[PDB]
Point group: C5
Chain length 304, copies 5
């Protein structure tokens, strides 16, 4: 089989559509998500045109091997999609309607800067390579883009599944490549964070505020690294900094500066000066909660 | 091959059945379970009808490629089911009886609100897409729905495996689609929870409460926090972190306040008696010692009222 | 191809055998084990009979597609076995001798009640479904059941690999099914447990009692709780959490009560050495110091009587 | 099919190119990375040559089975690449242009000596075995070597993707083998290390010294060891344990000596003042309080000079 | 296809060779290693013999399906090898030369008794089952056994890759089986251990002795058990739990007795001086402070004599 010949010179337009059936396994660490969807393709092949009056049939159904089908690939997939052809239908004018159900593991980067109050745009890039006979270009059939109502991504709210209607046409290894960007929009159900993560990690910090203070103020450090290890499956370590990987470098400083204060107050009163000891070791007791609110509100202004 | 032609205009009814052979790997985190079952399909294809007297046989056996077979798919599966055709039998009137043994990883959401005293309804959705030649509809053959007696799901009690007999017929991308809902009902085996998880998490906070009867309050208070997060680390494989709140997500969130209010009490009592007032020190440190166990069950009993 | 026709009415007997080549990955948590074995099958197909005088040869070798072969399946497997046909030999009477080497992931429940001093019977269930032409029944050829001497299952002693010679014949979805039970008996090599798990779990309970002899009782008594959960989660990969109770899930829950009742004492003795009651303080704090090693000895021996 | 015959004697030159589409899963522990790329191959096959005028076509497209294609393999791959042929184009002189999109798991050793300030050269080795008919040699078509702009490797900066243009030709099992070295060069994003890994672990060493200013020094000095190993376990997923020594494996090793020599000082100063000598006690306990931060900076700067 | 007929009665000799291309994933817990190698096979098939002057060709290349090829299998593999035929060459006398590149997950037991100063012999067992027509025996072609210079096994030193030249011929299920033993010899790069595991594991229970010089000894001696069990969990990925005992599984079990006997001495010295006897208190508390490092030195040297 060879591609449909052009009537003039025009490129062959392959109309596309993705209908999400399932979305699952959004792996934050691997920056992948699995998808199970319908992929619909439409193109005109005049060599397949027929007379409806003489044939008596409105539509003809073909086997994938019997006709020419465009080689559509996904850009950002780990391995090639697992695809099962559902249907191939040809109208009398020769317009082919292709439908396959596929599953794929998609590579899509995630921006964790605003975690756990972040929103993401997951991408599914469709691509086609041109043949020497003719150029193949991709288009979006908005009637065939969508999602099942039951599509659930645990811990996320699904907002929209849209496609950037204009393909990105470019040359790659001396041939044309037509790329479409399908985008799935999500937002984190951060409701849970306060209850289990935000509040109890803080009730360790808050519990951090003379030789007995050495056993007291150092525990709220040993337990902070245990809340960390005890819930690290929900804390992200990025190559850059997050508004939470910063709330982390602040708790580490705040747990230190508190034990710098209680290491200076219990050493100033012992080095013959107990007058100025109650001057800084009472002011830091109202200074810390306000130095914190100011700092966390200063951090918040930048990132979120 | 092409679908069987309609005698009038009627859609083709494909009778279905799922017989569970094995149920395994209920992954709470991934919200998946693996299934190994028989899938039975029945439909009328008049083009295959024969006379038993002339043929000499009462049944005819075909190879899947030799005849038309409906494209049945599962909705909520990770990848397509691994299927092996067991048998294809045709009766004299053209009634096809199809049987395959398949294995599949099923996506089925779990409600953890009542964990570990929860019950779930796992779903297996069967679906068929209609052809331009004719409309295909699914039906349940209750005689071919069931489960092996040996079907075991470790940590769960299997109640029932039934099917919603009425399919959900709907249009999708300009074609009819027929969807059936097979439901496997399961309740949890919560017996174990108290023994190793529920009771020992309490025997740390009761050991925070047996120090309200001081500098010793630090070594008894600040420890039954460090050890609570260590049972919470040491038994996290049994504790679920959901996007919402569970009756256990809260039953552990009350512990975070109770371990704090306990060290707010012992941070106010050991600071009031030191600031020249040891009279009112024994007034709050002694009532909080009988106040905490009653504030607790009142709270845990208040939580229990809403979730259960 | 179609099944061999019956001479009278009698079902077709398919003689079976499993020869274990490798046993590996006994996953206690998943309750699976992987197997690599030979599967031998024998049945009489008179249509394949030949004269050794005329054909010259005493045996005919066939390709799987060339002849009829019974569809033999495993019941308790996650997915279908990865099989490679080694040989198909047809003898003059028409007796077919089939041999394949397969590998499979087997689902076999494990009883952890006596862990780590437990023994198990792993099962491999062979099954065949009868066809419309005739009924198929399975049999055990004891000459073709066995295991390689090198078959090793790390951490276990392999006792025997036998088959229940009588198949379980039953009806399933309007057809006959013939099921054979192959059993691999294995026992646990518990020698290691004392050295790395049992003894140090105890040198923390023992070191909690070596402090029942006052402000130092706070630092000791509570540490041998924080360290107990560290030996636990520090070696949890060797401790099983079942839906039911084990003599080890019980051994580890008595420690939770003994670490608590040990800090019910260190809290009463600290309340008695104060609150103007010094006398009766040395009456219970000294008696509990000889009471518990024996209250423990009695309890663990009482537990042992029930389970093992 | 057979290889193209040589016009004189010359080996068949197969021009190669790898264009990276995706790079992912750089597994530091397994020393693997996954790749998804285009593989382009070009060679002259005169038997496929044609006249463009007489044929009416300027290019001829073939199916992989229709023509001879060189068996190109990757040396350092776990299993064989998953490949999908995109295009096969033949020009009038019979120059074949082959293009496939493949995915592969690549084995490439990583040097962790300078972690987290390390740079790596990941390799992809292309290889071809010669046939008896003729010798096949590999070449680099620099026009077909490259990477997509979007190629991202999380936690790494991608420097260059080049190929060593000269193949390594050698004999292996009585035939010639031609090997090309494709090098994807990378470097880390060490900015993050200070914030979350380097500084908090250092704050523990710093807070161990903020106690060199007597029985309370035992409870304070030993905690910043218990917490040191908790920062370690708490962030071990970012700390590498190699078969050799890393400047960080040494930086972690210096902390083990500095946390010991710190509690050797606080075990000698709190024992000298108690053994009737409190004069010389303030001589070493005060000098070590300004000695440690400078003995550390000197040591870490001495270590740094060697490795990085 | 059928096997080559014997000229007299002699068994067919299949000459073998394995050339290692890659060695990776030595999984200590699973007792597996992955291999990627060439497998070469040679046997005489007279039916394929040809005249060199008449044919014009000195070698004839065949497709695997075109000729008879011996079914060679690996004994100790999880699943069957992933194999890709590279070349099949026939010499005029009818000597076939077969070459395939395969990848396989090999089951090979590991002896951890001397860990981390252990050496291992990994095995790859090649096997052939004889056919009814004739007996097939395996041989080693030492010219075709070897390994690539780049073959690296992370954390191990590769010593040699040799084959036991004499096959183990035996009967299995009424047929002859010919088994060859290929051995890859490796040793552990134990240099790492001192740095990260060896010296720091000690410094914890070395720091338990730096407190045998009284009420502070309660707080210091007991957190040592808390930190040791954190150094252990903190580096458990490098400590092996075997069904048997090691020079390490004991080295870590002596520490459990030494961390206890340490707190038995402090549970006796800090209780004897308090129970009106402070004379004999300085007699045993000072002697145990020089007794422990020598009782340890002796014990570790006594242990060493047995195992290594
Ligand atoms: Cl794809
Ligand atoms: Cl499916
Ligand atoms: Cl079979
Ligand atoms: Cl099977
Ligand atoms: Cl082979
Ligand atoms: Cl194999
Ligand atoms: Ni498929
Ligand atoms: Ni299958
Ligand atoms: Ni196979
Ligand atoms: Ni190739
Ligand atoms: Ni492919
Ligand atoms: Ni292959």
């Amino acid at each position: 089989v060879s591609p449909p010949p052009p009537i003039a010179d025009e490129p062959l337009t392959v109309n596309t559509g993705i209908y999400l059936i399932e979305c699952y396994s959004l792996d934050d660490k691997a920056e992948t998500f699995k998808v199970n969807a319908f992929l619909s393709l439409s193109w005109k092949d005049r060599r397949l045109a027929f007379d409806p009056v003489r044939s008596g049939v409105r539509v003809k159904t073909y086997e994938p091997e019997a006709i020419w089908i465009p080689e559509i690939r996904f850009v950002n997939v780990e391995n090639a999609r697992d695809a099962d052809v559902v249907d191939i239908s040809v109208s009398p004018d020769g317009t082919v309607q292709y439908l396959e159900r596929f599953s794929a593991r998609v590579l899509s980067p995630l921006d964790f800067r605003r975690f756990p109050m972040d929103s993401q745009t997951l991408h599914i890039y469709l691509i086609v390579r041109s043949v020497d006979t003719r150029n193949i270009v991709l288009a979006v059939d908005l009637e065939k883009v969508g999602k099942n109502d039951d599509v659930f991504l645990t811990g996320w709210d699904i907002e929209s599944f849209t496609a950037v209607v204009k393909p990105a046409n470019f040359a790659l290894e001396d041939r044309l490549e037509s790329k479409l960007d399908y985008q799935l929009r999500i937002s984190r159900q951060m409701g849970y964070y306060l209850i289990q993560m935000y509040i109890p990690s803080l009730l360790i910090v808050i519990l951090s505020w003379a030789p007995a203070r050495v056993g007291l103020g150092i525990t709220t450090v040993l337990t902070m690294t245990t809340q960390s290890s005890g819930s690290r499956a929900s804390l992200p370590k990025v190559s850059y900094v997050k508004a939470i990987d910063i709330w982390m470098a602040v708790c580490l400083l705040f747990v230190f500066s508190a034990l710098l204060e209680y290491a200076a107050v219990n050493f100033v009163s012992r080095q013959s000066q107990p007058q100025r000891a109650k001057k800084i070791d009472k002011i830091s007791r109202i200074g810390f909660p306000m130095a914190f609110l100011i700092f966390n509100m200063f951090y918040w202004i930048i990132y979120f």
